[PDB]
Structure 1
Amino acid sequence: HHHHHGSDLGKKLLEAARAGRDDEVRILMANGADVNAADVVGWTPLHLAAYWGHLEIVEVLLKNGADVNAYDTLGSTPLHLAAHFGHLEIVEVLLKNGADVNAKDDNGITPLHLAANRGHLEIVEVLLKYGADVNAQDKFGKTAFDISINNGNEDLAEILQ
């Protein structure tokens, strides 16, 4: 799950997965490009596409066997990124294609913790729907309920129920 450095076509793909050029991603995939090319921080194209919300690319990479559960050097998966930045459709897509709904980064932080913290309520419900352990604790002992108290977002607290 921790992927290593590609080259030329691995670089080209990463750079294009980020900018949202849907054309060029399709070219490079057909021409052999490593779908799990990582960068210096361990971000595959699926990470990059999840972070900058390019849904089309996310489905395309998944069509070509991309690791839905790629880890970056800190334990953080593409679902983490999409959940955190409120990219709903990508969250659906990733969990539909096998994303580990309970993945913990090095800090014990789950996609639920993150969706919770940034108030992304629709995404929180979808994570719960697909198995998300609501009592998952990060390294400081915090659940996503504890998060909802500290933020004082009562909409969330009632969702967690």
Structure 2
Amino acid sequence: GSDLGKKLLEAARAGRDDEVRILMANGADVNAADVVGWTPLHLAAYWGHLEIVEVLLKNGADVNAYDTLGSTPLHLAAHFGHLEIVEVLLKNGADVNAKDDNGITPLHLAANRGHLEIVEVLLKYGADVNAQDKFGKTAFDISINNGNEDLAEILQ
């Protein structure tokens, strides 16, 4: 690991746009990762820092980086309702059908939290509506179990 890498992981998480800016100019490792395998892009996607997500991607971040449990930044963005980040990630080649170690996809996570607009975006980019997690569940199964009728309609 590198010192600039650590500083970038922290700045990305905290949403310090300007520090990120400077770190990018100085070549701070965009592919740095902490112990759980989170990159600056994972952090930015989780905490919802849109501008940093965009800067990171412009500076060669791996859009499809996965943590030690197989989760990608798209998983995080989708799960926590960050719509515009979701759209940017997808625009930049994020795998819409990425499965983590549990067979869980970004669609499962968005459905689980009832993020309707994010669900629609994912379907628009080719998300597999019939993907099953390790328990054989689909997004539709989640919607009915949660009793989310609007979401259930969409996934029909």
The whole-number CA distance in structure 2 between the counterparts of 1:157 and 1:149 is 6
Counterpart for residue 52 of structure 1: 47
Q: Deviations over 1:27-62 (max 9, x none)?
A: 011111111101010000000000000000000000
Instruction: Check if 1:153 corresponds to 2:148.
Output: yes
- Give, in angstroms, the shift of residue 134 of structure 1: 0.2
Q: Deviations over 1:136-159 (max 9, x none)?
A: 000000000000110010000111
5+ residue gaps in structure 1? 1-5
The whole-number CA distance in structure 2 between the counterparts of 1:99 and 1:121 is 19
Give secondary structure in 1 for the equivalent of 2:110: helix
Give secondary structure in 1 for the equivalent of 2:13: helix
| TM-score for the superposition, normalised by structure 1 | 0.96
Counterpart for residue 3 of structure 1: none
Of residues 123, 132, 135 in structure 1, which corresponds to 2:118? Answer: 123
Runs of 4+ that moved beyond 6 A:
none
The whole-number CA distance in structure 2 between the counterparts of 1:32 and 1:88 is 29
Aligned residues: 156
The whole-number CA distance in structure 1 between the counterparts of 2:136 and 2:81 is 24
Instruction: Check if 1:80 corresponds to 2:68.
Output: no
Give secondary structure in 2 for the equivalent of 1:139: coil
- Aligned 1:10-29 pairs, distance under 5 A: 10-29=5-24
RMSD of aligned Cα (Å): 0.4
Q: Deviations over 1:46-80 (max 9, x none)?
A: 00000000000000000001000000000000000
Q: Deviations over 1:89-140 (max 9, x none)?
A: 0000000000000000000000000000000000000000001000000000
The whole-number CA distance in structure 1 between the counterparts of 2:68 and 2:103 is 14
Give secondary structure in 1 for the equivalent of 2:78: helix
| TM-score for the superposition, normalised by structure 2 | 0.99
The whole-number CA distance in structure 2 between the counterparts of 1:129 and 1:32 is 35
The whole-number CA distance in structure 2 between the counterparts of 1:54 and 1:104 is 23
- Give, in angstroms, the shift of residue 7 of structure 1: 1.6
